[PDB]
Scaffold this active site. Structure first.
Site, PDB file in Angstrom:
ATOM      1  N   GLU A   1      33.311  37.785  49.628  1.00 28.73           N
ATOM      2  CA  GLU A   1      33.333  39.173  49.145  1.00 28.73           C
ATOM      3  C   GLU A   1      34.231  39.333  47.901  1.00 28.73           C
ATOM      4  O   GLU A   1      33.900  40.084  47.000  1.00 28.73           O
ATOM      5  CB  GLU A   1      33.775  40.121  50.271  1.00 28.73           C
ATOM      6  CG  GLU A   1      33.122  41.509  50.262  1.00 28.73           C
ATOM      7  CD  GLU A   1      33.754  42.479  49.264  1.00 28.73           C
ATOM      8  OE1 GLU A   1      34.993  42.664  49.286  1.00 28.73           O
ATOM      9  OE2 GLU A   1      33.004  43.068  48.460  1.00 28.73           O
TER      10      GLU A   1
ATOM     11  N   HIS B   1      33.031  40.243  43.551  1.00 27.10           N
ATOM     12  CA  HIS B   1      33.537  41.228  42.591  1.00 27.10           C
ATOM     13  C   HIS B   1      34.478  40.552  41.581  1.00 27.10           C
ATOM     14  O   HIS B   1      35.424  41.135  41.089  1.00 27.10           O
ATOM     15  CB  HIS B   1      34.186  42.399  43.349  1.00 27.10           C
ATOM     16  CG  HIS B   1      33.229  43.134  44.257  1.00 27.10           C
ATOM     17  ND1 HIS B   1      32.629  44.329  43.910  1.00 27.10           N
ATOM     18  CD2 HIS B   1      32.755  42.828  45.492  1.00 27.10           C
ATOM     19  CE1 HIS B   1      31.839  44.728  44.893  1.00 27.10           C
ATOM     20  NE2 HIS B   1      31.899  43.837  45.866  1.00 27.10           N
TER      21      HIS B   1
ATOM     22  N   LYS C   1      36.180  47.704  51.702  1.00 24.13           N
ATOM     23  CA  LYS C   1      37.012  47.621  50.537  1.00 24.13           C
ATOM     24  C   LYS C   1      36.437  48.329  49.338  1.00 24.13           C
ATOM     25  O   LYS C   1      37.193  48.828  48.531  1.00 24.13           O
ATOM     26  CB  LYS C   1      37.276  46.171  50.203  1.00 24.13           C
ATOM     27  CG  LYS C   1      37.498  45.333  51.456  1.00 24.13           C
ATOM     28  CD  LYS C   1      38.336  44.103  51.177  1.00 24.13           C
ATOM     29  CE  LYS C   1      39.668  44.182  51.898  1.00 24.13           C
ATOM     30  NZ  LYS C   1      40.614  43.185  51.331  1.00 24.13           N
TER      31      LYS C   1
END
Lengths: 327, 327
Positions: free
Chosen positions: A190, A194, A120
């Site tokens: 994950e 972020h 990603k």
């Protein structure tokens, strides 16, 4: 189907398990190989997915399935174990070099064929860019960012861009609905990484308890604006727009199998007639995250095989090549 | 841009003229050649489009432009005239063998490079299928159906299909808004041809008067349901669905530059999880027919050049290959 594509999956969390189920009904692709952190399973006649999934969830590794092998270098071992034309890297990139690391093991291994990921993050893709010659030298056709976004939605933007003399923005908004967060624990960890309060190490440092705590604040709903997302560099390499004109945000609801909004990409540009306008590609609310990631992944694996077969090696992105429908 | 792609356009009705204007601002593609029925224009330094358009509209052929040549075999002549890496066949397929005919002249000519069309009709594409070896033997990379639909919308459906284990339908609905019908007289005569009261010969037999008469009945609005449309065979050849699961209809308003509805393609299928669902790709109302046809056409020309350069010849459809953004 006399000669189906023989494929493997590395990583057997929720996504890799979904990938195995997606492949079951296929006629022209056969899952022969799975690895997880502590073990691997090979079976040239086709993996027994129920058995692998039981072994994994109940005994902690597919190495505990009927014909499984335990190993602390499952990947190294599995590579050498038999005939596989390509692998899907279902692995979380953890530590954040692990994909490249695994990729280096493939480079190092003497194996050639097709690799595919669903990374990603722009920076993980850059790590793979640095290896593009090493890949080509090794005889590997590597397809990166070949999931939902990047992947499907990135390819759609690339197609959509052909109506325009110049592109002004590519905006992706994704929705994810999962019944509980553990079902895709890595994917959720994950995302948290972020999130503005956090980063990758702190995300991985967190306990399941502390994770559930964070999610309670908002009834399990994560609202992610302007995330780091390799769509940006993929569309730059394909010559369509600069990375800064690509923005990716979304909503993940960890407490509902219904998607909290409809995933779409909007492509805005100027036509040769100086009109400014936008195309929109929207995904159906009942296509799950697993379907929108793993379907394209294997369509890119098949495409990558096509390229490999005609002697094209190196790094390809979803924006560069037409995926091929797998039957 | 030290070495821009050198391209030609055959057919200089409204679409071919639009194509020339679309190319003007490009840096890495240069229009060097136009042909129409009675004449041609070549200029290795770049065609002067204003001059060509004046010559054509005012004097009836681009052969009457500054450096033009009149000729009743303009195509034959233009081919031999100089360096062109590919051509866009902006020509109406009239008589309904003319594209193949022109294609045979290219085959016959000893020329190699890239050809692209924006054919609409399943049966014209079949005529090109029959020639696919002759093409490959001639060193030609031919991209067919590389307009709006087929083309852009067909490619979008191919991408969209990757989320699904099986495809149930691809439904295309297009909108066209033009100020008056003469601006794209061939395109409009071609629609009328596949209208239920009519056929290709009767369409071409009709006078401008009788055309305007028909259009008066409905204030210039043509409602076309389940038309013959090569999207169907293109998606079959790409392995995505059978032609019968592809339907194409639309509305053309000949009395308004505003598009009468938003052009879209809906892709319905079943995911590996047995969910039935649909993706939708919609075009912006201000992307004109000319932009949605000619933009993809040259993106496919560029892609075709990529394939040609690596020695891939033969017939490719829009569903098979990723078009490349032209700058």
């Amino acid at each position: 189907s006399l000669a189906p594509l023989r494929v493997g999956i590395l990583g057997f969390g929720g996504l890799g398990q979904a990938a195995a189920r997606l492949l079951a009904p296929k006629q022209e692709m056969k899952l022969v190989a799975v690895a997880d952190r502590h073990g691997y399973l090979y079976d040239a006649d086709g993996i027994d997915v129920d058995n692998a999934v039981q072994a994994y969830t109940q005994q902690g590794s597919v190495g505990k399935a009927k014909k499984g092998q335990m190993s602390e270098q499952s990947i190294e071992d599995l590579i050498g174990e038999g005939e596989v034309d390509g692998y899907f890297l279902a692995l979380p990139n953890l530590p954040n070099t692990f994909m490249a690391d695994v990729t280096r093991q493939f480079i190092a291994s003497g194996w050639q064929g097709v690799l595919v990921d669903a990374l990603k993050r722009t920076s993980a893709v850059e790590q793979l860019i640095t290896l593009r010659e090493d890949l080509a030298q090794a005889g590997i056709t590597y397809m990166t960012g070949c999931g939902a976004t990047p992947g499907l939605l990135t390819a759609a933007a690339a197609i959509a861009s052909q109506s325009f003399q110049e592109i002004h923005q590519v905006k992706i908004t994704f929705g994810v609905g999962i019944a509980n967060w553990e079902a895709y624990r890595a994917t959720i960890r994950e995302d948290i990484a972020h999130m503005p309060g956090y980063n990758v190490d702190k995300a991985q440092a967190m306990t399941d308890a502390e994770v559930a705590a964070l999610l309670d604040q908002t009834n399990g709903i994560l609202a992610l604006e302007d995330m780091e997302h390799a769509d940006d560099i993929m569309l730059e390499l394909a010559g369509i727009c600069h990375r800064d004109q690509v923005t990716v945000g979304g909503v993940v609801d960890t407490r509902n199998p219904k998607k909290p909004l409809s995933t779409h990409v909007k492509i805005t540009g100027r036509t040769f007639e100086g009109k400014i306008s936008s195309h929109t590609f929207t995904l159906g609310d009942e296509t799950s995250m697993a379907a929108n990631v793993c379907g394209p992944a294997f369509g890119y694996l098949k495409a990558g095989y096509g390229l490999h077969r005609q002697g094209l090696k190196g790094l390809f992105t979803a924006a560069d090549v037409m995926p091929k429908f797998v039957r």
